[PDB]
Nucleic acid binder design. Sequence first.
DNA 1: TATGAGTATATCC
DNA 2: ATGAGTATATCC
DNA 3: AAAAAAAAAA
Lengths: 132, 1170
Amino acid sequence: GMMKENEFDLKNAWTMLSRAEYQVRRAMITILADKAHVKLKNISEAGASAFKLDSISKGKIREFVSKQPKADSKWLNETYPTFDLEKKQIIILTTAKFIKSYTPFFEKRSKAFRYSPILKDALVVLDEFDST
Amino acid sequence: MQVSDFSGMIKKLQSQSPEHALMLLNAPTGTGKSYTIIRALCRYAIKHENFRAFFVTDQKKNLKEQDFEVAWREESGAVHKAFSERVAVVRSLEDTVNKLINDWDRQQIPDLYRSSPIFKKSLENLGNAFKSFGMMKENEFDLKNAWTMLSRAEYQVRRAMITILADKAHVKLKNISEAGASAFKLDSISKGKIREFVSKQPKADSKWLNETYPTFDLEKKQIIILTTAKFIKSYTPFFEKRSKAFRYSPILKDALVVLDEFDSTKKQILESAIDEALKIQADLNSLFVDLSKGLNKVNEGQLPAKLGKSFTFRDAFKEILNDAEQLTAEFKLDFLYKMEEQGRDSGFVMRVPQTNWVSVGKPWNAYFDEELRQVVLGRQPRNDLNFQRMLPRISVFLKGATKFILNRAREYQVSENQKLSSLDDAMTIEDACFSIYAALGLSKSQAKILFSLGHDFSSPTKVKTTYHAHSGRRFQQRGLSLFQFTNDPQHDLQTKINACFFNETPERYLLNLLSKANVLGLSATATLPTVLDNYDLGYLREMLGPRLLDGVHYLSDTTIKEFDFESRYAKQKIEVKVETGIVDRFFSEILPKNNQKIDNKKIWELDAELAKLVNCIPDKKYFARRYLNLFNSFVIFLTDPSMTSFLGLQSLLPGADGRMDENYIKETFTTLKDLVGGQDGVNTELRIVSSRNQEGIQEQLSEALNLVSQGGKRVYILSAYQTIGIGQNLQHEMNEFEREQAANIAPKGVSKSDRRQHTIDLAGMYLGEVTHILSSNLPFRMDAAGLRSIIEQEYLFDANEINIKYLNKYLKGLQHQRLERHPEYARSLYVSYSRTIIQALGRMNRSFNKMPLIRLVMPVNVLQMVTDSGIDVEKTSQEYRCLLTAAKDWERDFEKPSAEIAKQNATFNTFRDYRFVLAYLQTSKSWAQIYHDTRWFYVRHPTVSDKDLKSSQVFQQRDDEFGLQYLLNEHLDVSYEVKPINHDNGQFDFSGTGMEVSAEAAGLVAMCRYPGLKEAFESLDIPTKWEPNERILNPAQFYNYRGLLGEVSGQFIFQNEWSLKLADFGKPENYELFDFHWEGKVVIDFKNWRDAPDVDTKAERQKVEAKLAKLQANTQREWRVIIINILASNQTRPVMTVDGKILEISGLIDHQGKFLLTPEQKLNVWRFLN
DNA sequence: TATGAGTATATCC
DNA sequence: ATGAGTATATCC
DNA sequence: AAAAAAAAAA
Ligand SMILES: Nc1ncnc2c1ncn2[C@@H]1O[C@H](COP(=O)(O)OP(=O)(O)O)[C@@H](O)[C@H]1O
């Protein structure tokens, strides 16, 4: 926020903010991993930077948070919609975000909305069509 | 020591204009080293207007800006130059920004930039950027981006200043730059006008501009003061956006570089080198393919004639193209390498001059899947491409090709600089190399990695037949390489082999610097023998010879006699007392157990507090000893009506963690002060001099010592070795107590105006453990710590301090995360420990007044670790000598294990050289000549004098000691005995008994007993007996020696007896397969061995039949083969295989030199010969 | 030689 | 899968 | 007409 004046250095500040947010996400990932008994070690040792997982481990995490109490799972889903995007029936966003990418949970490289399979057969409602 | 001595040193160094010698000076601290070098540099700069010098030191607290200003003021006599246009201080970007902000806050900007609104806005933006940079200093990933933002802000400030100066000089900036924005590319004339204007400007304005921006006119600066870290990196010129490296700048040509912390610089340089090596990585396959493609474009004349006509006329170019084609065909590098992972970590592969290394055990294999049209890489047993051979071969090719391209780029730069009229915008060697690489079609990253394989180092010119630079240290010559395999979904079709090469050790950087500038190295420990915290002086002297000068040759003997202190200390009855701390667990052991017992409870909750603090650490039982040693030290401090100044140095700075907790130490000190010492401790205080405080170390030290000089107190200064352990002044002005208590040791013939006559040195020092001599990081990954670890071990191996056994054990431990103990008899470890201790003890030798009794307190480990091996204790401080006399109970012997390790390492290196040369001689022609020459050198004289070995056609032609690693005979013996451990790996033990190297296996016995054989030896100039001389062959060399001797003798006797003339082969790709041939019918192989053991018949037959089969496929004939032995002890029996194609004869002549081949045998010989 | 004449919004690199 | 116990400096 | 140095196996 201190460096929102110039745009040339906005890229670097955005990069630092993204790295910090990714660290927060990694902390949450390892918390849920130790709370779900999942072999975080596979990642945590073979992935002490990249931190990749497999489908079954994230599925176990998702089904654990599914049966979790209402309040905490509610906060997690509200703040991190990308935690499980293939279950969201409605996705509300700005067109500036729609053109750009979204950063999935359990991952660091962002994925563009344009090529993602989530748009296939979806219905896109442009609330101000001409202004878009 | 007088300034005339350093003037003589400087003028001697400047007389080496085309050679650029290196001069080193050992002088104990507190002798004038830094006082007089500054005066000498200033005086020489004033007298000679074309003299340029650099003053380099590791820590900016040792830059001595004020000392340079004072010396310049007192040296200039008539003109009185403002010292800002002659002497410059090149600060980092952060320090420049800090000075700018401070000047802005103190109204010190000279009202010309202040009045402008553009400048003010730029300064406000710079202040915000500096605040952000300070906030983001925690994570090093954000450090790069914060630094980039700060650099952009500083550049905007510079642009504002440029516009302000341009309009005042009527320069059309915009027109010179660009009506638009990003530009400001001014011509030489405009900036010349600007420089003229500031030259005629009022003095205050010019002084501020020149101090803040020394790079405003960098050519006028005669002395340039900067840190080692800044010297390694680049400086940003004024008027420009891109920074220019000091390394390739024309500012260094014929300059004099004064490294005031040689040898402390090496580590810094090393660290920087490691970081740079990790920044630059590229896919090896694509890099090689692109370079090959570019070179082929050069061949077909598709590049401008300027470089094309210089590439093509050299035979090395044709050879490089041929090697590129052969390597592309051999390793299938045209195709994609795909490495299938199911998710398991791949680790990485290391290549060190001794071996390959895989971090996950199973070696990597690669074959060509023809159906897939890919190269499958993985852990499968199938290895049809020799991947572990592919990785280093491509690296060797890249290194050689890049050296060729560097030579061509040097030629191109020299030719292009002729065209330029104003030699102010000349292109550097780096620019020429980048232009060549870009013209070849390589990317910018590929150009960076190819250029870093060797940085503009191409040697001199056949040394003009002066001195032969030779070295047997393999790590300095080959470096090391790292490879990691990466799979990404965005390049799903292939696996990237990211490569990381480390070649520029600090010694190589220093040699490259010496290729263009004189270097003067100054410290009290400049020549301590150690390769961990000092340059490899052995390697430096090997590669420099006469160019490695000595400084003490330019001092009067009075100064050297003044270096002594054991006489002056005795004459004034100064007594040094070493107190070692035998403390393990609890605090009653440090309290004075004399019968003034206060309470048996208060110390118990003191122990409880200590245990509580230790337990709250996120190993224990060791931090307690550190705390107790420190507490014992300042108990000793608190119980003496003396010792007005005490310094306690550790290897750790007090902070927030429990392992060394700051406020806990403070409260412990206060409790001990009110618990021990009634009137002794009331006048005491504690100061923690640290970089974590909100003010510079200079004022912290100044106020801590003013507490004693003026406050009438007794201070305990606690800090770390890395903070104020080197080159820091800790003396203070005396008080009445010190005046009436201290003693003076000033030599007869010293002035009263000297500051050393009005100050008093420290009266006591606590020497904590020096902890980080060798790395201990455990998770071994491809990062800075792992590289530092591997490089330290390679340095130890080069200096003959660890053998291949210990290195293999260490690597195996690293594969398992089970690091081994430090080597017990590695001299460098103890010498580095001693170096830190010596530097620490030099901080209390900066004055002539000393307290009558000095107390040095340290734990027992410091006593056990220090040593005197290669350290001239005669010219060291008396405190260190007393410490050594106290530590004499643990003195080690390093000469013996070093000698045997040197023998083992020389043998191992010879064996590795020969393992390489056979495989390469497979497909070479000249290296056959080198191998022939080396073997004949072996047999012409097994024992050779040192000068005779150094001056030879085989030693003067190779630039290293390939195959020529002779042992050392301290007794000039003619024989020795060695027990082989693993002859497959070339490992030998020179204390065991399993084989004899002497003339008994030579022609002396059982070989000269043949008619005409001794005549053949005397005709071929092969001595019959090993004459006692200096150096003797090693077991790896003795193998080839006896093999060639047996070859000659057996072929001679075979020709004498069977009366047949054999012929040699003439096809290059089938060398080292069979010794000779016979009439296109037979291939003949000769052997020299002991009595026949229970040798593995099947492996020998498999190998000989494999070479036979490849010769069958190549010669288009069916061939026989003969295996022949020269000496035996029983009945000879030539046994053939059932088919009858292979002959095996064991022993030709007996031990009496007469053959054992009867008429029957003979005839069979004829029958097999046909 | 020749005109038209802002403020504001949002996200990744 | 134990041996051993850090601070200093500066460009991308 | 000044490119280097490339065993297996652990
Ligand atoms: N004529 C002199 N010769 C040498 N040192 C002097 C002289 N006059 C004063 N000094 C002081 O003596 C001290 C010796 O330290 P110095 O020589 O700078 O470091 P070193 O002895 O490590 O080279 C310095 O602090 C310097 O200011």
